[PDB]
Coordinates of C-alpha atoms and ligand atoms in Angstrom, one line a residue:
Chain A
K17 CA 70.4 19.3 120.3
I18 CA 72.6 16.6 121.8
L19 CA 71.5 13.7 119.5
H20 CA 72.3 15.9 116.5
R21 CA 75.9 16.3 117.8
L22 CA 76.2 12.6 118.7
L23 CA 75.3 11.5 115.2
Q24 CA 78.4 13.3 113.9
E25 CA 80.8 12.2 116.6
Chain B
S26 CA 73.0 3.0 97.5
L27 CA 75.1 0.2 98.8
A28 CA 72.2 -0.8 101.0
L29 CA 69.9 -1.7 98.1
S30 CA 72.9 -3.5 96.6
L31 CA 73.3 -6.0 99.5
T32 CA 72.3 -9.6 99.3
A33 CA 70.2 -11.2 102.0
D34 CA 73.3 -12.9 103.6
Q35 CA 75.2 -9.6 103.4
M36 CA 72.3 -7.7 105.1
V37 CA 72.2 -10.2 108.0
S38 CA 76.0 -10.1 108.5
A39 CA 76.0 -6.3 108.5
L40 CA 73.2 -6.2 111.1
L41 CA 74.7 -8.9 113.3
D42 CA 78.1 -7.2 113.2
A43 CA 76.6 -3.8 114.2
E44 CA 75.0 -5.3 117.3
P45 CA 75.8 -3.3 120.5
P46 CA 77.2 -5.0 123.6
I47 CA 75.2 -6.0 126.7
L48 CA 76.1 -3.4 129.3
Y49 CA 76.2 -3.6 133.1
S50 CA 74.1 -1.5 135.4
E51 CA 75.2 0.6 138.4
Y52 CA 73.4 -1.7 140.8
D53 CA 74.8 -1.7 144.3
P54 CA 73.4 -4.5 146.6
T55 CA 74.5 -2.7 149.7
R56 CA 71.3 -0.5 149.7
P57 CA 67.7 -1.5 149.5
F58 CA 65.6 -0.5 146.4
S59 CA 63.5 2.6 146.5
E60 CA 61.4 4.1 143.7
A61 CA 64.0 6.8 143.2
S62 CA 67.0 4.4 143.2
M63 CA 65.5 1.9 140.8
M64 CA 64.5 4.7 138.4
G65 CA 68.0 6.0 138.8
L66 CA 69.5 2.7 137.8
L67 CA 67.2 2.4 134.8
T68 CA 67.6 5.9 133.4
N69 CA 71.4 5.6 133.8
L70 CA 71.3 2.3 131.9
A71 CA 69.2 3.8 129.2
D72 CA 71.6 6.7 128.9
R73 CA 74.5 4.3 128.3
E74 CA 72.5 2.1 126.0
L75 CA 71.4 5.2 123.9
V76 CA 75.0 6.1 123.1
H77 CA 75.7 2.6 121.7
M78 CA 72.3 2.7 119.9
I79 CA 73.2 5.9 118.1
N80 CA 76.3 4.3 116.8
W81 CA 74.5 1.1 115.9
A82 CA 72.0 3.1 113.9
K83 CA 74.8 4.6 111.8
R84 CA 75.7 1.0 110.8
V85 CA 72.2 0.1 109.7
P86 CA 72.3 0.0 105.9
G87 CA 70.6 3.1 104.4
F88 CA 70.5 5.1 107.6
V89 CA 73.5 7.3 107.0
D90 CA 72.1 8.1 103.5
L91 CA 69.5 10.4 105.3
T92 CA 70.0 14.0 106.4
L93 CA 70.9 14.6 110.0
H94 CA 67.4 15.9 110.6
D95 CA 65.8 12.7 109.3
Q96 CA 68.3 10.6 111.3
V97 CA 67.4 12.6 114.4
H98 CA 63.7 12.2 113.7
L99 CA 63.8 8.4 113.3
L100 CA 65.9 7.8 116.4
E101 CA 63.7 10.3 118.4
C102 CA 60.6 8.4 117.4
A103 CA 62.0 4.9 117.9
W104 CA 64.5 5.0 120.7
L105 CA 62.3 3.4 123.4
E106 CA 60.9 0.8 121.1
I107 CA 64.5 -0.2 120.3
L108 CA 65.5 -0.3 123.9
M109 CA 62.5 -2.4 124.7
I110 CA 62.9 -5.0 121.9
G111 CA 66.5 -5.4 123.0
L112 CA 65.4 -5.9 126.6
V113 CA 62.8 -8.5 125.5
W114 CA 65.3 -10.3 123.4
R115 CA 67.8 -10.4 126.3
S116 CA 65.1 -11.7 128.6
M117 CA 63.9 -14.6 126.5
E118 CA 65.9 -17.2 128.4
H119 CA 64.6 -15.9 131.7
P120 CA 60.9 -16.6 132.0
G121 CA 59.2 -14.3 134.5
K122 CA 62.1 -11.9 134.6
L123 CA 63.5 -8.9 132.7
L124 CA 67.3 -8.9 132.1
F125 CA 68.0 -5.2 132.1
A126 CA 71.6 -6.1 132.6
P127 CA 73.6 -9.2 133.7
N128 CA 73.7 -7.7 137.2
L129 CA 70.1 -6.4 137.1
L130 CA 67.6 -9.1 136.6
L131 CA 64.2 -8.1 137.9
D132 CA 60.8 -9.8 138.3
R133 CA 57.4 -8.2 138.3
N134 CA 57.3 -7.9 142.0
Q135 CA 60.4 -5.7 142.0
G136 CA 58.7 -3.7 139.2
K137 CA 56.1 -2.7 141.8
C138 CA 58.8 -0.6 143.5
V139 CA 58.0 2.2 141.0
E140 CA 54.6 3.6 140.6
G141 CA 53.0 2.6 137.3
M142 CA 55.9 0.4 136.4
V143 CA 54.6 -3.1 137.0
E144 CA 52.0 -2.5 134.2
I145 CA 54.9 -2.0 131.8
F146 CA 56.9 -4.9 133.2
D147 CA 53.8 -7.1 132.6
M148 CA 53.6 -6.2 128.9
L149 CA 57.3 -6.7 128.3
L150 CA 57.2 -10.1 130.0
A151 CA 54.2 -11.1 127.8
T152 CA 56.3 -10.0 124.8
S153 CA 59.2 -12.1 125.9
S154 CA 56.9 -15.0 126.4
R155 CA 55.6 -14.5 122.8
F156 CA 59.2 -14.5 121.5
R157 CA 59.8 -17.8 123.3
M158 CA 56.5 -19.2 122.0
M159 CA 57.7 -18.4 118.5
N160 CA 61.4 -19.4 119.0
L161 CA 62.5 -16.0 117.7
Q162 CA 65.9 -16.3 116.1
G163 CA 68.8 -13.9 116.6
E164 CA 68.9 -13.2 112.8
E165 CA 65.2 -12.4 112.9
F166 CA 65.6 -10.2 116.0
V167 CA 68.2 -7.9 114.3
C168 CA 66.0 -7.5 111.2
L169 CA 63.0 -6.5 113.5
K170 CA 65.1 -4.0 115.4
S171 CA 66.2 -2.3 112.1
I172 CA 62.6 -2.3 110.8
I173 CA 61.6 -0.4 114.0
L174 CA 64.3 2.2 113.4
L175 CA 63.3 2.9 109.8
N176 CA 59.5 2.5 110.2
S177 CA 58.4 4.1 113.4
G178 CA 58.9 7.7 112.3
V179 CA 58.6 7.2 108.5
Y180 CA 55.0 8.3 108.4
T181 CA 55.8 11.6 110.2
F182 CA 58.2 13.0 107.7
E183 CA 62.4 10.5 97.8
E184 CA 63.9 10.1 101.3
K185 CA 60.7 8.3 102.2
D186 CA 61.0 6.2 99.0
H187 CA 64.5 5.3 99.9
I188 CA 63.4 4.2 103.4
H189 CA 60.7 2.0 101.9
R190 CA 63.2 0.4 99.6
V191 CA 65.4 -0.5 102.5
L192 CA 62.4 -1.8 104.4
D193 CA 61.5 -4.0 101.4
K194 CA 65.0 -5.3 101.4
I195 CA 64.7 -6.3 105.1
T196 CA 61.5 -8.1 104.3
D197 CA 63.3 -10.1 101.5
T198 CA 65.9 -10.8 104.1
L199 CA 63.5 -12.1 106.7
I200 CA 61.8 -14.4 104.1
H201 CA 65.3 -15.6 103.0
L202 CA 66.1 -16.5 106.6
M203 CA 62.9 -18.4 107.1
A204 CA 63.3 -20.3 103.8
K205 CA 66.9 -21.2 104.7
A206 CA 65.5 -22.5 108.0
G207 CA 63.3 -24.9 106.2
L208 CA 59.9 -23.2 106.6
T209 CA 57.3 -23.9 103.9
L210 CA 56.1 -21.0 101.7
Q211 CA 52.8 -20.8 103.7
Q212 CA 54.7 -20.8 107.0
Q213 CA 56.9 -18.1 105.6
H214 CA 54.1 -15.5 105.2
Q215 CA 52.4 -16.6 108.4
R216 CA 55.6 -16.1 110.4
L217 CA 56.4 -12.8 108.7
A218 CA 53.0 -11.6 109.8
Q219 CA 53.3 -12.9 113.3
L220 CA 56.7 -11.1 113.7
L221 CA 55.5 -7.8 112.2
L222 CA 52.4 -7.8 114.4
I223 CA 54.6 -7.9 117.5
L224 CA 55.8 -4.4 116.4
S225 CA 52.3 -3.1 117.1
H226 CA 52.6 -4.3 120.7
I227 CA 56.1 -2.8 121.0
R228 CA 54.8 0.5 119.7
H229 CA 52.1 0.3 122.4
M230 CA 54.6 -0.4 125.2
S231 CA 56.8 2.4 124.0
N232 CA 53.9 4.8 124.1
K233 CA 53.0 3.8 127.7
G234 CA 56.7 3.9 128.7
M235 CA 56.9 7.4 127.3
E236 CA 53.9 8.5 129.4
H237 CA 55.5 6.8 132.4
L238 CA 58.8 8.5 131.9
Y239 CA 57.0 11.8 131.6
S240 CA 55.3 11.2 134.9
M241 CA 58.5 10.4 136.7
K242 CA 60.0 13.7 135.3
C243 CA 56.9 15.7 136.3
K244 CA 57.1 14.3 139.9
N245 CA 60.8 15.0 140.2
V246 CA 61.5 11.3 140.9
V247 CA 64.9 11.1 139.2
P248 CA 67.2 13.6 137.5
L249 CA 67.1 12.9 133.7
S250 CA 70.2 13.5 131.6
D251 CA 70.0 16.1 128.9
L252 CA 69.9 13.4 126.3
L253 CA 66.9 11.7 127.9
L254 CA 65.1 15.0 128.4
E255 CA 65.5 15.8 124.7
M256 CA 64.4 12.2 123.6
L257 CA 61.4 12.6 125.9
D258 CA 60.6 16.1 124.7
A259 CA 60.6 14.9 121.1
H260 CA 57.3 13.1 121.9
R261 CA 55.7 16.3 123.1
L262 CA 53.6 14.7 125.9
Chain C
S9 CA 34.6 -23.3 114.8
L10 CA 33.7 -22.5 111.2
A11 CA 36.5 -19.9 111.2
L12 CA 39.4 -22.3 110.7
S13 CA 37.6 -24.1 107.9
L14 CA 36.8 -21.0 105.8
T15 CA 38.6 -20.6 102.4
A16 CA 40.3 -17.4 101.4
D17 CA 37.4 -16.4 99.3
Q18 CA 34.9 -17.3 102.0
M19 CA 36.9 -15.2 104.6
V20 CA 36.7 -12.1 102.3
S21 CA 33.0 -12.6 101.7
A22 CA 32.3 -12.9 105.4
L23 CA 34.3 -9.7 106.1
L24 CA 32.8 -7.7 103.3
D25 CA 29.3 -8.8 104.4
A26 CA 30.0 -7.9 108.1
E27 CA 30.9 -4.3 107.2
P28 CA 29.1 -1.6 109.2
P29 CA 27.2 1.2 107.5
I30 CA 28.6 4.7 106.9
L31 CA 26.8 7.0 109.3
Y32 CA 25.8 10.7 108.8
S33 CA 26.6 13.5 111.2
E34 CA 23.8 15.7 112.6
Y35 CA 26.0 18.5 111.5
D36 CA 24.2 21.7 110.4
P37 CA 26.4 23.0 107.5
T38 CA 25.0 26.6 107.9
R39 CA 26.6 27.1 111.3
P40 CA 30.3 27.8 111.9
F41 CA 32.4 25.5 114.1
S42 CA 33.4 26.0 117.7
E43 CA 35.7 23.8 119.7
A44 CA 32.6 22.6 121.6
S45 CA 30.5 22.0 118.6
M46 CA 33.1 20.0 116.7
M47 CA 34.0 17.8 119.6
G48 CA 30.2 17.3 120.2
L49 CA 29.8 16.2 116.6
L50 CA 32.8 13.9 116.7
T51 CA 32.0 12.3 120.0
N52 CA 28.4 11.8 119.0
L53 CA 29.6 10.1 115.8
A54 CA 32.1 7.9 117.6
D55 CA 29.4 6.8 120.0
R56 CA 27.1 5.7 117.1
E57 CA 30.0 4.1 115.2
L58 CA 30.9 2.1 118.4
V59 CA 27.4 0.5 118.5
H60 CA 27.8 -0.7 114.9
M61 CA 31.4 -1.8 115.6
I62 CA 30.2 -4.2 118.3
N63 CA 27.8 -5.9 115.9
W64 CA 30.5 -6.1 113.2
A65 CA 32.9 -7.7 115.7
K66 CA 30.4 -10.5 116.4
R67 CA 30.4 -11.3 112.7
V68 CA 34.2 -11.5 112.4
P69 CA 35.0 -15.2 112.1
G70 CA 36.3 -16.6 115.3
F71 CA 35.3 -13.7 117.5
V72 CA 32.2 -15.3 119.1
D73 CA 34.2 -18.4 119.8
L74 CA 35.9 -16.4 122.6
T75 CA 34.6 -15.9 126.1
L76 CA 32.5 -12.7 126.6
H77 CA 35.4 -11.4 128.8
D78 CA 38.0 -11.9 126.0
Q79 CA 35.6 -10.3 123.5
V80 CA 35.3 -7.3 125.8
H81 CA 39.0 -7.1 126.3
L82 CA 39.8 -7.1 122.5
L83 CA 37.2 -4.4 121.8
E84 CA 38.4 -2.3 124.8
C85 CA 41.9 -2.4 123.5
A86 CA 41.2 -1.9 119.8
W87 CA 38.2 0.4 119.6
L88 CA 39.9 3.6 118.6
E89 CA 42.3 1.9 116.3
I90 CA 39.3 0.4 114.5
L91 CA 37.5 3.8 114.3
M92 CA 40.7 5.3 113.0
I93 CA 41.5 2.8 110.3
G94 CA 37.9 3.1 109.1
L95 CA 38.2 6.9 109.0
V96 CA 41.5 6.7 107.0
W97 CA 39.8 4.2 104.6
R98 CA 36.8 6.6 104.0
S99 CA 39.2 9.5 103.4
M100 CA 41.4 7.8 100.9
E101 CA 40.0 9.4 97.9
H102 CA 39.9 12.9 99.5
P103 CA 43.5 14.1 99.7
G104 CA 44.1 16.5 102.6
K105 CA 40.6 15.8 104.1
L106 CA 39.1 13.5 106.6
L107 CA 35.7 12.1 105.8
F108 CA 34.2 11.6 109.3
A109 CA 30.9 11.4 107.5
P110 CA 29.6 12.1 104.0
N111 CA 28.3 15.4 105.3
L112 CA 31.2 16.0 107.6
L113 CA 34.3 16.2 105.5
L114 CA 36.9 18.2 107.4
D115 CA 40.2 19.4 105.9
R116 CA 43.5 19.7 107.7
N117 CA 43.1 23.2 108.9
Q118 CA 39.8 22.6 110.6
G119 CA 41.4 20.3 113.2
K120 CA 42.7 23.6 114.6
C121 CA 39.2 24.3 115.9
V122 CA 40.1 21.9 118.7
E123 CA 43.1 22.1 121.1
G124 CA 45.7 19.4 120.3
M125 CA 43.6 18.0 117.5
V126 CA 45.6 19.1 114.5
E127 CA 48.5 16.8 115.4
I128 CA 46.1 13.8 115.2
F129 CA 44.5 15.0 112.0
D130 CA 48.1 15.2 110.5
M131 CA 48.9 11.6 111.5
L132 CA 45.6 10.4 110.1
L133 CA 46.1 12.3 106.8
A134 CA 49.6 10.8 106.4
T135 CA 48.0 7.3 106.8
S136 CA 45.4 8.0 104.2
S137 CA 48.2 9.2 101.9
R138 CA 50.1 6.0 102.5
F139 CA 47.0 4.0 101.7
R140 CA 46.6 6.0 98.5
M141 CA 50.2 5.5 97.6
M142 CA 49.8 1.7 98.0
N143 CA 46.5 1.6 96.2
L144 CA 44.9 -0.2 99.2
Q145 CA 42.0 -2.4 98.1
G146 CA 38.7 -2.7 99.9
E147 CA 39.3 -6.4 100.4
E148 CA 42.7 -5.7 102.0
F149 CA 41.2 -3.1 104.2
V150 CA 38.6 -5.4 105.8
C151 CA 41.4 -8.0 106.5
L152 CA 43.5 -5.3 108.2
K153 CA 40.6 -4.1 110.3
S154 CA 39.9 -7.7 111.5
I155 CA 43.6 -8.2 112.3
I156 CA 43.5 -5.1 114.5
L157 CA 40.5 -6.5 116.4
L158 CA 42.2 -9.9 117.1
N159 CA 45.8 -8.7 117.5
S160 CA 45.9 -5.5 119.6
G161 CA 44.9 -7.0 122.9
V162 CA 45.9 -10.7 122.3
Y163 CA 49.1 -10.4 124.3
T164 CA 47.4 -8.5 127.2
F165 CA 45.6 -11.6 128.2
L166 CA 47.4 -14.9 127.1
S167 CA 47.9 -15.2 131.0
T168 CA 47.1 -18.8 131.9
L169 CA 45.3 -20.9 132.8
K170 CA 44.1 -22.7 131.1
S171 CA 42.8 -20.1 128.6
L172 CA 45.8 -20.8 126.3
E173 CA 43.1 -22.3 124.1
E174 CA 42.0 -18.7 123.6
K175 CA 45.4 -17.4 122.5
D176 CA 46.3 -20.3 120.2
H177 CA 42.8 -20.2 118.6
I178 CA 43.2 -16.4 118.0
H179 CA 46.6 -16.9 116.5
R180 CA 45.2 -19.6 114.2
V181 CA 42.5 -17.2 113.1
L182 CA 45.1 -14.5 112.5
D183 CA 47.1 -16.9 110.3
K184 CA 43.9 -17.5 108.3
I185 CA 43.6 -13.7 107.7
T186 CA 47.2 -13.6 106.7
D187 CA 46.5 -16.4 104.2
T188 CA 43.5 -14.3 102.9
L189 CA 45.7 -11.2 102.3
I190 CA 48.3 -13.2 100.4
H191 CA 45.5 -14.8 98.4
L192 CA 44.1 -11.4 97.4
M193 CA 47.6 -10.3 96.3
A194 CA 48.3 -13.5 94.3
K195 CA 44.9 -13.1 92.7
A196 CA 45.9 -9.5 91.8
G197 CA 48.9 -10.9 90.0
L198 CA 51.7 -9.9 92.3
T199 CA 54.9 -12.0 92.3
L200 CA 55.9 -13.9 95.4
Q201 CA 58.5 -11.3 96.2
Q202 CA 55.9 -8.5 95.8
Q203 CA 53.4 -10.3 97.9
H204 CA 55.7 -10.6 100.9
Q205 CA 56.8 -7.0 100.5
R206 CA 53.3 -5.7 100.3
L207 CA 52.2 -7.8 103.3
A208 CA 54.9 -6.3 105.4
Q209 CA 54.1 -2.8 104.2
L210 CA 50.5 -3.3 105.2
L211 CA 51.2 -4.7 108.6
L212 CA 53.8 -2.0 109.4
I213 CA 51.0 0.5 109.0
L214 CA 49.3 -1.2 112.0
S215 CA 52.2 0.1 114.1
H216 CA 51.3 3.7 113.1
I217 CA 47.7 3.1 113.7
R218 CA 48.5 1.9 117.2
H219 CA 50.5 5.0 117.8
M220 CA 47.6 7.2 116.6
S221 CA 45.2 5.4 118.9
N222 CA 47.4 6.0 121.9
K223 CA 47.7 9.7 121.1
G224 CA 44.0 9.8 120.5
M225 CA 43.3 8.3 123.8
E226 CA 45.3 10.9 125.6
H227 CA 43.5 13.7 123.7
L228 CA 40.1 12.2 124.6
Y229 CA 41.2 11.9 128.2
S230 CA 42.2 15.6 128.3
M231 CA 38.9 16.5 126.7
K232 CA 37.1 14.7 129.5
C233 CA 39.0 16.6 132.2
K234 CA 38.6 19.9 130.4
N235 CA 34.8 19.1 130.4
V236 CA 34.8 20.6 126.9
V237 CA 32.1 18.1 125.9
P238 CA 29.7 15.7 127.7
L239 CA 30.7 12.1 126.8
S240 CA 28.3 9.2 126.6
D241 CA 28.6 6.4 129.2
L242 CA 29.8 3.9 126.5
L243 CA 32.5 6.3 125.4
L244 CA 33.6 7.0 129.0
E245 CA 33.8 3.2 129.7
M246 CA 35.9 2.6 126.6
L247 CA 38.1 5.4 127.6
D248 CA 38.4 4.2 131.2
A249 CA 39.5 0.8 130.0
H250 CA 42.8 2.4 129.0
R251 CA 43.1 3.7 132.5
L252 CA 45.2 6.8 131.6
Chain D
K4 CA 29.5 -2.8 131.7
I5 CA 27.7 -1.3 128.7
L6 CA 30.0 -3.1 126.3
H7 CA 29.3 -6.4 128.1
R8 CA 25.5 -5.8 127.6
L9 CA 25.8 -4.9 123.9
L10 CA 27.8 -8.0 123.2
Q11 CA 24.9 -10.1 124.4
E12 CA 22.0 -8.3 122.6
Ligands
36J8 C1 60.7 -1.3 131.7 C2 60.8 0.0 131.0 C3 60.1 1.2 131.6 C4 60.1 2.3 130.7 C5 59.6 3.7 131.3 C6 60.7 4.3 132.1 O1 60.2 5.4 132.7 C7 61.8 4.7 131.3 C8 63.1 4.9 132.0 C9 63.8 3.7 132.5 C10 64.3 3.0 131.5 C11 64.2 1.6 131.4 C12 64.8 0.9 130.4 C13 66.1 1.1 130.3 C14 66.9 0.4 129.4 O2 68.2 0.6 129.3 C15 66.2 -0.5 128.5 C16 64.9 -0.7 128.6 O3 64.3 -1.6 127.8 C17 64.1 0.0 129.6 C18 62.7 -0.2 129.7 O4 62.1 -1.0 129.0 O5 62.1 0.4 130.7
36J9 C1 40.6 12.5 114.7 C2 40.4 11.6 115.9 C3 40.7 12.3 117.2 C4 40.5 11.4 118.3 C5 40.5 12.0 119.7 C6 39.2 12.4 120.2 O1 39.3 13.0 121.4 C7 38.2 11.3 120.3 C8 36.7 11.8 120.2 C9 36.4 12.3 118.8 C10 36.2 11.2 118.0 C11 36.7 11.2 116.7 C12 36.5 10.2 115.8 C13 35.2 9.8 115.7 C14 34.8 8.8 114.8 O2 33.6 8.4 114.6 C15 35.8 8.2 114.1 C16 37.1 8.6 114.2 O3 38.1 8.0 113.5 C17 37.5 9.6 115.1 C18 38.9 10.0 115.2 O4 39.7 9.5 114.6 O5 39.1 11.0 116.0

C-alpha cells in the first residue's frame, strides 16, 4: 500500500 | 518515550514546528468552473496536502513509536478530519468563505458547482464561524489537530495505552495554554470541553465527506490518485 | 430558565430522574435467529426506545426552552447516537456482548446474522470496553448523553437571525453540564490534573459515538432499500432527516 | 411530522 511506503520515505 | 517526557511548552513548540505549509492550487482562471474541474482542483490539492500530512504526522510526539500498521491505521482513519480542521483554521479570517488555497477561496455558491458539495461547505463554514466565536488560538489548533490524529482510530485497534498517555499529555498542554492565557480554572474546563466537542462535528463532516468522495468515484466524476483511492478504500463504504 | 440556575448536584438529580426505562424485547428465546427476525426485533425495540427518548429529552434542563423546530432538529441529528450510548452503557458489565434488552443479550458473533452488522457490533463493543476500562459512572453517563443531545446538531443551526439566543443559551447549558461532570470527578477525589484528563477522555468518546451513528445510519438506509424489514413511520422519518 | 407531534403531547 502507498501510505505504507510513504511512511518510510 | 521522549513524548511523555516533554513539558507543555516543549510539546507546543514541537507541534508548531511540525506545521505543514499552506500550498497553492492548480487553479486556472482562463476556464469556467465545472463539477469535474472543481473536483479535479480539490482532489489534486488533497493529494499534495496528504504528502505533507504524512510527514507532519511523523513529527507528532509519540506517533513514530507505533508500528507501521498502527501508523497506517491512524492516518487512514483521520486523514480527512485533519484536512478539514486545517481548512477551517485557514478560513477563520474569511467569513463566508473557505480558503482551500491562497489562490482558491470559495464561497457556498461556488460549492453548488458540485453535486452534494454545498451541504459540506455549509458545515465547514459553520465550524469556521464557531472557531471565530471562540477566538481559537494557533497553539490550541495544533493540539486539536494532533488529538484527531491519535484519537480517531484508537478505538478500532500497550500501544493503546501509549496513545492514551500521549493524549493525556496533550490535554495537560491545552490546559497549560489556557492558564497561561489568563483563563480562570472554571473557564479552563469549560473551554476544554467546547474545543473537544468540536471534534464530534469534525468527525461528522469527515464521514459525510467520505460518502461524497465515494459518490464522485462511483460516478466517474474525477480520476482519483492511487493514494486517495487507498485512503478512501480504508473506510470501506 | 431554571437550567442556568441549577447547582451541580441539582443537575445530576434532574438527569437521573429523567432516565427512560429499560425495555424488553418481544424476542421468543426458543426460536433461532434469521436476518429478518433479528432486524425486526431491533427495529421494533428502536421504535419503542425512541418514544421514551422524546419524553426524556423534554426533561433535560434547557431543552424545552428551545423552539419546537430546534428541539426537532437536535433529536433528528442525535437520535441514533443517543440510542447507541445507552446500549453501550447497558452492556458495560457484559464483556463481549450487547444488552439490547435484558432478554436480548447478543454476543459479537450474532451480529453476523445480519449483513454488515458485525462491523457495527464491533465498534459498539470497543466503546463498552473503553467505558469499562475507565470505570464510567452512572452519573457521568447521564451527563454525556445530555451533552450529545445538545451538542450534535447545535452547529447545524446557529444560522441567524436572530435565533443566536438559541445557540448561546445551548452553549451556556452545555457549560453547566461540563461543570457537573467536573463536580462529580472532584467529588470522587480526582486531582485537578486527573479531572481535566478524564473530562477529555470522556468527550473524545463522543467522537467515536458520532462515527458509529453515521455508519449505523448508512446500514439502516441499506436495510430500507433491501426491504429486509418493514420500518415504522417514526423510524423512517428519523432516517430521512439524515437525507442519505 | 411524527416527532413534531410527540414533542407536543
Ligand atoms: C470541502 C470538502 C469536501 C470533501 C469531499 C470531497 O469529495 C473530497 C475531495 C476534495 C477534497 C477537498 C478538500 C481538499 C483539501 O486539500 C482540503 C480539504 O479540507 C478538503 C475538503 O474539506 O473538502
Ligand atoms: C447495533 C446498532 C445497528 C444500527 C443499525 C440498524 O440498522 C438500526 C436499526 C436497528 C436498531 C438497533 C438498535 C436498537 C436500539 O433500540 C438501540 C440501539 O443501540 C441499536 C443499535 O445500536 O443498533
